[PDB]
């Protein structure tokens, strides 16, 4: 309870938590429903700077793709932790009863099978980030005492 | 930051200052013999040269473990001159010129540790 | 103090964290299925990793 977590003011996340009949998500909804500070932000960018200014006090709940882009393609002062709570999926559409659904669906599955969508994602999300990948090799937490502690 | 080479450059400033007093006392000993018992001034010179050569041996040893090989090259020729003193074991004008260069070399390299140390501490 | 903090609580970390990390160390011999989806996917792969 030390970190207050909030979501968008009017979005799909708030509607999902309002109809989530799960004990893990139910207790989270009643906590976010009654809170003295602002646990709902109208703009996703206003909630982003709120997390950067809270410094470990506001955990914003957003989608996976938007979280990975705002972490890599922006000054990386925040990071994504944990797996996805629910499961969704994007998709291109087509008017009801149109001849441009069959071949289009076959082209989407063909691109996803040939490893093309994974390449386009890794190019626009990682190969073009703002702060980049500084020290890609994750420095393991050295259990030994550092030198600066007794400097 | 705080590296092992940064700490090695800090111990040199305290130790190289003591090497400065040795080469200065050597010029005073040479000046006294030039003006003019005699064994006292020469025996005291033999007791002073041994620590001066042994202390510099640590300067070539500390930087060896500190991976600062760009500074070791500035001290290897100084240690090579000590080998000629131990291998052989007028002379007044020769020793005078062989001592003024020590004061200049031990001072120009002294300012390096005063600046190369800052090039690592504040560069965090 | 540090030796007392060591024996009190233990924090064992995994030697790896992703697939792009083990492809650079090459210290752990990793294996897959003989014939299936994983083998066919790793066969025709355009990404470098």
């Amino acid at each position: 309870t030390e970190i207050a977590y909030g979501t968008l003011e009017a979005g799909s996340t708030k509607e999902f938590f309002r109809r989530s009949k799960i004990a893990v998500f139910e207790k989270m909804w009643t906590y976010m429903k009654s809170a003295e500070p602002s646990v709902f932000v109208r703009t996703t960018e206003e909630g982003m700077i709120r997390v950067r200014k809270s410094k470990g006090k506001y955990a914003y709940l957003l989608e996976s793709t938007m979280n990975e882009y705002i972490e890599q393609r922006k000054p990386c002062d925040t990071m994504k932790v944990g797996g996805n709570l629910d499961s969704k999926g994007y998709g291109i559409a087509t008017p009801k009863g149109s001849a441009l659904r069959g071949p289009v669906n076959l082209a989407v599955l063909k691109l996803s099978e040939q490893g093309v969508l994974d390449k386009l994602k890794s190019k626009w999300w990682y190969d073009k980030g703002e702060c980049g990948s500084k020290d890609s090799g994750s420095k393991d937490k050295t259990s030994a005492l550092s030198l600066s502690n007794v400097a | 930051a705080f590296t092992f080479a940064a700490f090695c450059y800090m111990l040199t400033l305290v130790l190289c200052a003591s090497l400065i007093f040795f080469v200065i006392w050597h010029i005073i000993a040479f000046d006294e013999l030039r003006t003019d018992n005699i064994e006292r001034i020469c025996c005291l010179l033999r007791k002073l040269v041994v620590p001066e050569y042994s202390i510099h041996g640590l300067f070539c040893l500390m930087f060896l473990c500190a991976a600062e090989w760009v500074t070791l090259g500035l001290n290897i020729p100084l240690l090579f001159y000590h080998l000629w003193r131990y291998f052989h074991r007028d002379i007044l004008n020769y020793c005078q010129k062989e001592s003024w260069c020590k004061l200049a070399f031990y001072l120009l390299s002294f300012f390096y540790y005063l600046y190369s140390m800052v090039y690592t501490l504040v560069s965090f | 103090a540090n030796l007392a903090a060591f024996l009190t609580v233990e924090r064992m970390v995994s030697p790896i964290e992703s697939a792009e990390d083990l492809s650079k160390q090459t210290e752990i011999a990793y294996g897959t299925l003989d014939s299936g989806s994983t083998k066919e996917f790793f066969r025709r792969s355009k990404i470098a990793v």
Binding site: T142, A144, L145, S146, L147, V150 | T3, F4, F7, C8, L11, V14, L15, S18, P51, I55, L58, M62, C65 | N2, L3, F6
Partner: peptide, 28 residues
């Protein structure tokens, strides 16, 4: 409990303190 960078700093600080004390006990 102590990183390898500190163990290398202790030995050279030990010898450094020793030679400094020897130099101080020499001018007298």
């Amino acid at each position: 409990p102590l990183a390898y960078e500190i163990w290398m700093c202790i030995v050279f600080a030990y010898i450094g303190v020793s030679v400094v004390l020897f130099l101080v006990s020499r001018f007298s």
